[PDB]
Amino acid sequence: IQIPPGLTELLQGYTVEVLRQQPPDLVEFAVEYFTRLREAR
Amino acid sequence: IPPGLTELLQGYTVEVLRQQPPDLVEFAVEYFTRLREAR
């Protein structure tokens, strides 16, 4: 299976902010995190 | 490590491996938005 470049780094960056912020709702936090990151490009 | 974190990210990562999307972040926005909708 081809492993996309940047996959581990993407998962790591989300995890670092989950550990810092301790969001009760990981799914809502993912929607917001990945939306913000798409916009930070 | 919060309960649920590894399993949540595994569903996303399975779909990335299956679907080979070109933009991982856009695929994450879509996947977790649709999971939030389903919930």
Binding site: I1, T8, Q12, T15, V16 | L5, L9, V14, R18
Partner: peptide, 18 residues
């Protein structure tokens, strides 16, 4: 199999974030 590969990738990313 893809599901086990995904588990390894995720678990390793979480370990690295710590």
């Amino acid at each position: 199999q893809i599901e086990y590969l995904a588990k390894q990738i995720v678990d390793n990313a979480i370990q690295q974030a710590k």
